Ligand binder design. Structure first.
Ligand SMILES: C[C@@H]1CCN(C(=O)CC#N)C[C@@H]1N(C)c1ncnc2[nH]ccc12
Length: 286
């Protein structure tokens, strides 16, 4: 498969939770004709964390979809995950740097691909648990993939939610209220997070405008650092919400706000989202 001695470090691509991502060249012929891949390793190896890594790997290996990043193989010593390298980086950085070449119509095209890939996940009873533009990957100008599965689980098998509480730091400003209060993750919590993704896209990743910044302002940067979770749970309870981004059409903002339903069961499905997005798209064309 992939040999460690044949893998040359080029640069750091990312870190996420308890993983890092590197750009390496696989060059078994050692003639600089090998192919550029992305390699994910544990940033600090544990038995628990690696139990979890091996699962993430099985999860990705089991995914074959146009909008899902592409398992190439594995590498021991010790354990490394080889994926396809996508040359435009995360949707987050791409959109920030290049706002520029990206209109609303393109944002809905991405949005729609995010939905299709997430629907494929749901097909498999996978909860992603970490939908955020930084985890979306740009293949070319016209194509995005879901790029990382570090927190992804399977749904238990009588149950439509999966309850998990992880050591350290959670992306709480992308979490559904039930995930904050009850630690419950489901397709519907993914859909909550999808709405936040959609908000990020429409803000063009303006720094002052990020979810944390916005929510922190709404809460008070003079609240605390630990009651932050409490105040955010309250805010969301009282139907406090991320503002409509500058430029956002009311009907995209309506998608967003429907994803941020406190009622888990009333949030739309990914198939419905794709239908509505694809369709707002068409009315924007002709
Ligand atoms: C957006 C991708 C998913 C998250 N990334 C991490 O490093 C997460 C962890 N740990 C960066 C990665 N990225 C910038 C990539 N950039 C280019 N090709 C890639 N293949 C796979 C990831 C990848």
């Amino acid at each position: 498969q992939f040999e460690e001695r044949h893998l040359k470090f080029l640069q750091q691509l990312g870190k996420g939770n308890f993983g890092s991502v590197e750009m390496c060249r696989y060059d078994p012929l050692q003639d600089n004709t090998g192919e550029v891949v992305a390699v994910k390793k544990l940033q600090h190896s544990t038995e628990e964390h690696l139990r979890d890594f091996e699962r993430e790997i099985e999860i990705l290996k089991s995914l074959q979809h146009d909008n899902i990043v592409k398992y190439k193989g594995v590498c021991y010593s010790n354990l490394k995950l080889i994926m396809e390298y996508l040359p435009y980086g995360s949707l987050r950085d791409y959109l920030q740097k290049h706002k520029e070449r990206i209109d609303h119509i393109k944002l809905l095209q991405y949005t729609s691909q995010i939905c299709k890939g997430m629907e494929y996940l749901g097909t498999k009873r996978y909860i992603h648990r970490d939908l955020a533009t930084r985890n979306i990957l740009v293949e070319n100008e016209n194509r995005v993939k879901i790029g990382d599965f570090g927190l992804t689980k399977v749904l238990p098998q009588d149950k439509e939610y999966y309850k998990v509480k992880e050591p350290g730091e959670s992306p709480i400003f992308w979490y559904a209220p039930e995930s904050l209060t009850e630690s419950k993750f489901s397709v519907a919590s993914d859909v909550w997070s999808f709405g936040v993704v959609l908000y990020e896209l429409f803000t063009y990743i303006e720094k002052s405008k990020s979810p944390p910044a916005e929510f922190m302002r709404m809460i008070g940067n003079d609240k605390q650092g630990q009651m932050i979770v409490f105040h955010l749970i309250e805010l969301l309870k009282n139907n406090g919400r991320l503002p409509r981004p500058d430029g956002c059409p009311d009907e995209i903002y309506m998608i967003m706000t429907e994803c941020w339903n406190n009622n888990v069961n009333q949030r739309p499905s990914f198939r419905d989202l794709a239908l509505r997005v694809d369709q707002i798209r068409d009315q924007m064309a002709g």
